[model samples]
Target: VKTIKVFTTVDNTNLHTQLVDMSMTYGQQFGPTYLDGADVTKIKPHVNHEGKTFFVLPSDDTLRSEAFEYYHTLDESFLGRYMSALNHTKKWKFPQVGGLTSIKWADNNCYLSSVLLALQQLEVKFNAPALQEAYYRARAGDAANFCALILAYSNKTVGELGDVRETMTHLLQHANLESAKRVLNVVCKHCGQKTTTLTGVEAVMYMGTLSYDNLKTGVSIPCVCGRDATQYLVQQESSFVMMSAPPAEYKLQQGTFLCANEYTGNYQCGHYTHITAKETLYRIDGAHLTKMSEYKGPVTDVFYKETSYTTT
Candidate 1:
């Protein structure tokens, strides 16, 4: 309690005030009186090298060292400088999808460009002002106008954009929704690492009367050890108007057993996907994948889900 004595030596300081303001433990060893009985002179030279106020401390040295002091520099100066530079950015190398010309960092804004490509591909026409409203509304509910199917399926394309079966089938048949820039973050459970993958989209050719049933696209990304992890759409509610089935909007999620409280960030690395409904366990021991254990019930707690469409 040398630190407490040291703090007590300084009565009017903020740290001392907080220490004095600390709640009593009600006869516990760490009671408010715990600071008592220690001499201020004894504490005068005590550096508390052991870091014990006889109390609490948190985390690895790396954590303490890594959190360097930072400044709040990204406000007023940034917002004022953000706009005029937009029009001057480098043009997209790939064919500009729809009339919306893109920039070099197209993938960064796939949420917008993806929809723009969809609008152009589906041959949709909109009043200029309506485009802004629908786009603004799209962010509001994350759905650009349902009629336009103006959404890009880039990396997460289960090819499900709109609720209408005809439009879904329409966009599903064309290669326009596929993104040349989309990327998927593949995570490996057995290996305990994550990887980035760009599984390029290819059009599934249908050469006859347009009757298609179980047409599918690849959602699985192979880990470094080549274990396939596929996205399984399991949510509490089915909000989309589905004629067949919901577009399997495969995305890395959070708070599952595999993911375990990792936040969704760039590349969405930590929380990935699993292929099956059953929780199957395996080990890549000695160059072979041998089944070790299995759980009969669902493993994913499913804190969040990604669905392509939702009905009005």
Candidate 2:
């Protein structure tokens, strides 16, 4: 008989929100289609596991956008059967056209970092199976939520986003700006150039490639620049916020603006031109946003739990 050994690596890219956000910025080049009727359904459950341990994978498809493709991490063991679960609708909620993707686990190293820090921080008695399973789900859930918030609009732009700018601002007000800035720096470097001007619709898309935890709600919002950045987007009652598509003309002396060209994703801009008075300004209704920053909640937890069960 022959024996084989396997190893798991976090890839440094796995569950990296900035990388995920970058993919969303790319999604805008093609413009996504949004359908009103689309809602959540239970997909075939998939399994994932922590290194050499048991966990579950969510039924949610974290990478449903034109942004990227999803890869599942399944559980495996040496000469032994891995954990498995029969499909159950009540237990698993698959990724809807707009549901979030969050990762609950990564490589063993991350697991160690997170688990040890958690143990030391909370100093709670560990429940091996529960903790193992919960950790996997939590990470997976975070990834899912990140995807939903950043790419939820698909190719729709501000039309699908609604008052997302204000919501994002509200979320960012309480977020850790330092951590958020770190993610933004990485996103700006890896995804594309940073700029102040984008076509009205395009600007919101640009804003999506960031990591901010809504401080007030504690939900992770991946597209925020910061609290100030958020306020800017929603300024003038969202005339500037840009949750809706751009009008045919520019308003007044729109000031010197900076922008990222859609074709190249490079920073570019010049003098502002106002031909507007011809086009109608847009006002967005925040309620229409089907998917908001729900990174920390039952939805995320449930999705993570499913991810653990299936992947493992």
Candidate 3:
């Protein structure tokens, strides 16, 4: 209690208030009765090696030094020792406020640039296709928008973005009624949003303007190779090409699990095809054929497809 005696002797009311507000036990031990019982003059004078004695007063620097030392002593203790009570001050926590784009530092302009560089590097490490595009855009100086996008997607889900690059692209391009229903399930599952339904317009908006504009050129078309009829569409450079072939050109493999059609006369396979590209697939709520690498169900293999269509 030498510290308490010293504080009382020096009339450190603010530090006494902080101690009292923080801890009842310590506050009572350092209370007025104890201060009144103790002799203020008994506080030992600080003596230098030169044999000079100086009166110890609680100056701002001395108070700060004492507080720092007290806190430092608690650093190696469990339950934080004295700090356990001081946690009520809320001074040691990060501010609960803005997103990555709005957080301030010693130099906010420099901090923003640093954050942009850090996020771009993290995207490179994540290697998400959608984020790669965003990273390039950020590197091209669309830092604010791209930084916010990174945090938005990051907050929704963790590692799903890296896996669902094409799925993101597909939603951006084909966000209609059916595609909205299709993507809502996938996006919600990935992002953990509890959205049960999404309209054509809402879906388009949610995916972002740039994604929607970039992908709107893609279309969904009925595949001619399945009895159940699949929508086979591929994203081409600047366009989404719908593929079709004559019944003769569409060979029905006997072991194919996805060919549920009769493949008989007049019943040509109206199957969805993604032969032009290494088709990125997404999970649908229904039993939609998926070629997404993560999907394990029986569906058409993306790499081993034969359709007489090539993007010229």
Candidate 4:
């Protein structure tokens, strides 16, 4: 049989001590072996402290600890043993196989790379030869797109003029989409308005104007804009703003969650709402931001995911 060995201890002295200590507990507690009551020596390992040597006895600490170590070593080696046996018995590769090309420190970048590699490899190994080429191309394109995005941030990649020009260009095209989304989101009754199926192109434009009104005039989304009467796709920008209480009656404040309830800001949504909003998008309702403060565009070719919690 083949073996996978791990040289865990240099001296084995500490290990012996730990094992002996453990055996004492096990022998005394509920193991197959037990000493007569109050008989510590019955389970004790022979510890020659002066000689710097140790021997395991039927003691609680020694037996249990040694058994545990043995099994742990075995448990780790089980895979190797199984594979060796499979050298003749099984010809198939292990299921769910995958790997990585390079480690990227940026969030989700490395994960994206690894997942692409796994998907491509699986496509090739399986009989899906047609999918294999597509997978490879997709992986390459994804990698390139991510690189391009990173380059865009440096300002030189978009043009010699840098990201400033690219950003200005985006703003000109979108034309206040960001600021409008921000205001409509804060003052509206439905925080989900930005993304809901109810919000269409006209709703989007109206939302931008509504946002500006809410910021400048300090009022709720005017119910009178014929918004309820109009279709989600129809234009309601001017009509909606007119429905509000002249925007002058509306109040505007910091709107921060931390102090909204007790302080001057609106307590409509809690701290969690703010967090969720930052992660979500407004203009294109289905869209979401990859990271806080970072904007994404149609040019963004690579897609990835990141998780925030841990398991027990």
On a 0 to 1 TM-score scale, where does candidate 4 land against the true structure? 0.16
Give candidates' CA RMSD values in order.
24.9, 23.6, 22.6, 24.6
Q: Would you list the C-alpha lDDT of every candidate in the order shown?
A: 0.26, 0.20, 0.26, 0.25
Q: Which ten residues in a row have the lowest lDDT in candidate 1?
A: 234-243
What's the lDDT for candidate 2? 0.20
Give each model a TM-score. Answer: 0.18, 0.17, 0.17, 0.16
Superposed model 4: Cα runs more than 4 Å off: 1-154, 157-312
Residue 98, candidate 2: Cα error in Å is 25
Candidate 1 at 31: error in angstroms?
A: 61
Model 4 / residue 283 / CA error / Å: 20
Q: lDDT tens digits, residues 84-196, model 4?
A: 32232222111221121222323222222323332332211212221233334345442332222222222222212222122222212322222212113222343324422
Worst 10-residue stretch by lDDT in candidate 4? Answer: 256-265
| Number of the top lDDT candidate | 3
Best by TM-score: 1
Q: For every model in order, what is the number of clashing pairs?
A: 2, 45, 14, 13
Model 2, TM vs. native: 0.17
Give lDDT tens digits, candidate 3, residues 1-312. Answer: 222222332212233322122223322433222222222233332222122211222335654455334222212221122122222211211221112122222211221232342232221222233334445655554433333333333222211222122223322332223333212211222233222333333322222111222233432323333223212112212112111122233322322212111112222322222111123332221112233343222222111222122232
Q: After superposition, how far is residue 63 of candidate 4 from its true place, in Å?
A: 77
Question: Worst 10-residue stretch by lDDT in candidate 2?
Answer: 298-307
